[PDB]
Amino acid sequence: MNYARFITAASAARNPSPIRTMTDILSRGPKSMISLAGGLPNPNMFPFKTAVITVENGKTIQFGEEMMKRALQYSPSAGIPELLSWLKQLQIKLHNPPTIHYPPSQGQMDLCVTSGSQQGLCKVFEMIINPGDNVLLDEPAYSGTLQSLHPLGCNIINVASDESGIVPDSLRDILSRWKPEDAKNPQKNTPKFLYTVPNGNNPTGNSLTSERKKEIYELARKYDFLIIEDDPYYFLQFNKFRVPTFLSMDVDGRVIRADSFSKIISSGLRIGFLTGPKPLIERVILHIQVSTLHPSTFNQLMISQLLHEWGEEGFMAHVDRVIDFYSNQKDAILAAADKWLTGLAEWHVPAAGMFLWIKVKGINDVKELIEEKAVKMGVLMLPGNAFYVDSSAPSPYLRASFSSASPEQMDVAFQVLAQLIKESL
Amino acid sequence: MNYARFITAASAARNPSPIRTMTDILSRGPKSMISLAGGLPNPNMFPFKTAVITVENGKTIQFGEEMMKRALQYSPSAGIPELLSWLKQLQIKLHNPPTIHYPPSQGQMDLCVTSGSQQGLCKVFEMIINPGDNVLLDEPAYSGTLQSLHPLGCNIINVASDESGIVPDSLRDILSRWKPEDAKNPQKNTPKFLYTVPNGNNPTGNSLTSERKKEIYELARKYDFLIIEDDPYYFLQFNKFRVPTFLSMDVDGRVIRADSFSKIISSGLRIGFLTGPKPLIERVILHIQVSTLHPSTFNQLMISQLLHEWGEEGFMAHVDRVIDFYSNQKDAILAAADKWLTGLAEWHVPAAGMFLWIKVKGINDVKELIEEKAVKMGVLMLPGNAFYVDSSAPSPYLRASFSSASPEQMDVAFQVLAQLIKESL
Ligand SMILES: O=C(O)[C@@H](Cc1ccccc1)N1C(=O)c2cc(Cl)c(Cl)cc2C1=O
């Protein structure tokens, strides 16, 4: 409702930046208009001329001469228009966000293609956080989020979580420290936002439920904080039905959502996108305009043509192929865990994503059990310390990836792990 | 010599971020080592499988199965190793920087590939600037640089410039506001850095001279400030011998240089690179680690393989073709201007780049002459207002691009402008 509350002075001071009134007054005027006003380098000097890219379960992608010149040239900061248009329709299909037809100033849905979803998240954090601001999230969390938040000088307030994600009663108790009207009085610093990964949290593998999302949203309205929905595993849910998203229930216009193709189409191409209230997305776009300028035009065209040939049906058929693969990998690593972790450890079934989160019994810290004893036995799993704000505290947890390993490799790996737990007790 | 002086609290607080101890303890240990510690998604689900990219004056570039899988997956934040090593050798060949073998803490030359050179520049500004800080640069300046600096709250101090770039006497006079020893006393805020585009300034087309660079460098030592050498037109100089760069005379380790392939190889692939003192480059790398993560692996491999097949010889042959083209366009737009600007305007001959800077005589502000009268006559050139800190002040200057226009188009465009000037005198 009042987005200025969530925008630092620096972010608010931004104004629009280059490649401006050159390819828009010429993108509608007569074909006889000469423009020596543009800052674009002549693409005929560029040495790549054509491209052919083969696709599994899809038409081969071809960049002819003119399409290649476009791919090698600057493009809009928010993304190329045909990709933004497809993605917007996808978001309407998947989430029917309440904000689609709101006035801009009151949170009309808006999209920005980013150079990876993490770029969008970083610029969102920078847009909002003043030193000393309070922010809410569940630990353990993606180490990259914690390392992004650390230098911004916010107080991270841990919200309790279990196998169903954030626990609303913990969030409610935390918020009781304030009165709601304090959100209109910045003197005692009500939380600016809540961040969470609602599906297949890295490292736990846990997902939020529909009912807790609703509860959490009512509290976000009551104390007027934003929800940053970081959902890179959204297209990797193993349940029959995808849980409704925060975006899908965002009647106020207080959700900023991050999507990624990093886990399902390509991480190396650095393509993700933000969906959120237009006034906040605009502040991110202005920062992009003085930073990366835009995501790679070449990589956007690769993905846009892939998606447009697939149609929504072919895209969703791809995600079902990826769901099939990761859920079978999940079944395999759970079988190896049941097999070898013998009442030596505890774990919850991952609801989505690509990680299994193992609590080792009878040991207070495992990073000495792994980085010393396990490495020379030819096995490595990631100690859980790195996923907490205080990464020096002891952690009995290990994060095990099931994205790649064969059942044979899982059997050997959990064999070795079992031996190292027993001889350490 | 004291780099902490040039690093903000936030920037200094950054710690090294993900994709860490997984592909380095496995990149040297035995191949019998199993790792479930890694976080990488399975590239076999990614739908692009092979690529063939044709090159003009070059061997076609082929991404086979394994190369494509690498192209589609995460890679190091500073860039892929073979691109970094090639570029490092290029910088040694072009600039022979005095810092190559310095100890890290006193400015050992280091490089970062960035997602466009502007990303590296932006993160350099963010690394350095506290609100209230004083910075030096010459106006008119790239509008993207002015829009980047404005929200950081620094006081921009304009240094005088002429057809030979920054005037050293002007820089010396401005600095006489402080005593040299004031640089070791942050209380009265000596300038943190001087920023300049030394070759083919956008919008003026002017370039610095060797003698002036040496003078400027001496002042940067005397008053102990950094030089940010933003040099995107370095490979578009019309002379036979390139002017030595600030980097080439940087015996103190106080130069941060930005290079770009945007103007000669591809703007759309978003590839640039920073060269500078290792302590400062490292701060930028850590910001990339929580932001874009890395430049497109696919696009880095395209460029890297092209560069490795060309060798430095093939690369320099390419730049000389492009110089030749742009120098002929320059000759052409100067002819048009001689022909139809009849003592109606003044201009200097551009020394590099792709722009001509035209001062209309007898008119105080041209943006009404262009955005109103010229548009309906079918001709567009860019008013100079956008290239100054105060973009509301009147400007008699126009920027005209000679990157693309045919001689016929130039002849028409300047005929129209001439008529408008004459009937607008
Ligand atoms: O680069 C990234 O964004 C991802 C890649 C990824 C892909 C699929 C599933 C999960 C992550 N990534 C992590 O989140 C992560 C955490 C830690 Cl603790 C380490 Cl040590 C390394 C990484 C990492 O590469």
- With contacts defined as CB-CB under 8 Å, which chain A residues touch B59? none
Ligand 1 atom closest to the CA of A118, numbered from 1: 3
Asked if residue A279 lies in contact with residue A5, where contact means CB atoms within 8 angstroms, the answer is no
Asked if residue A92 lies in contact with residue A99, where contact means CB atoms within 8 angstroms, the answer is no
Q: Judge: A49–B56 Cβ closer than 8 Å, yes or no.
A: yes
Continuous H helices in B81-156? 81-95, 117-128, 143-149
In this structure, what is the dihedral angle of CA atoms B268, B270, B276, B277, given to the nearest 10 degrees?
170
Domains of chain B: 1-72 (no CATH), 73-310 (3.40.640.10), 311-425 (3.90.1150.10)
Reference B412, options B373, B380, B365; nearest CA is B380
Reference A293, options B266, B226, B361, B209; nearest CA is B266
For B:80-139, CB contacts with A below 8 A are 115-116, 118-119, 122-123
Reference B152, options B123, B181, B175, B176; nearest CA is B123
Q: Is the peptide bond before A203 cis (omega within 30 degrees of 0)?
A: yes
Task: Give the Cα separation of B397 and B358 in Å (integer).
Answer: 5
Strand partners, A399: A357, A382
Task: Give the Cα separation of A6 and A227 in Å (integer).
Answer: 11
Phi, psi (deg, nearest 5) at residue B419: -55, -45
Q: Helix, strand, or coil here: A141?
A: coil
- With contacts defined as CB-CB under 8 Å, which chain B residues touch A409? 34
Task: Give the Cα separation of B142 and B116 in Å (integer).
Answer: 15
CA-based torsion, B135, B139, B142, B148: positive or negative: positive
Q: How many of the other CB atoms lie within 10 Å of CB of B265?
A: 24
Is B74 within any annotated ligand binding site? yes
Element holding B158 (H helix, E strand)? strand B155-158
What does DSSP assign to residue B131?
T
Q: Helix, strand, or coil here: A41?
A: coil
Choose the residue to mutate in B15, B17, B19, B289 for probing ligand 1, maximizing ligand atoms within 8 Å of C-beta.
Answer: B19
For A:15-74, CB contacts with B below 8 A are 15-18, 20-22, 25-26, 29-30, 32-42, 45-58, 61, 70-74
Task: Give the Cα separation of B46 and A2 in Å (integer).
Answer: 41
Nearest Cβ partner of A292 from B13, B115, B355? B115
Burial class of A311 by CB neighbour count within 10 A (0 to 12, 13 to 18, 19+) = exposed
Strand partners, B110: B276
Q: Helix, strand, or coil here: B367?
A: helix
Degrees (nearest 5) of the Cα angle A8, B17, A254? 35
* Beta strand pairing call for B34-35 and A379-380: parallel
Resolution (A): 1.8
What does DSSP assign to residue B237?
B
CA B344 to chain centroid? 33
Asked if residue A201 lies in contact with residue A346, where contact means CB atoms within 8 angstroms, the answer is no
Element holding A71 (H helix, E strand)? helix A65-71
Reference B13, options A146, A287, A386; nearest CA is A146
Asked if residue A359 lies in contact with residue A319, where contact means CB atoms within 8 angstroms, the answer is no
Task: Give the Cα separation of A162 and B245 in Å (integer).
Answer: 58
Task: Give the Cα separation of B2 and B392 in Å (integer).
Answer: 39
Find the length of chain B.
425
Residues with CB under 6 A from ligand 1: A 142-144, 202, 263, 354, 382, 386; B 18-20, 22, 39-41, 74, 293
Phi, psi (deg, nearest 5) at residue A342: -105, 40
Per the structure block, which two tokens stand in for B169?
A: 């006497």
CA distance A354 to chain B (A): 8
Task: Give the Cα separation of B84 and B408 in Å (integer).
Answer: 43
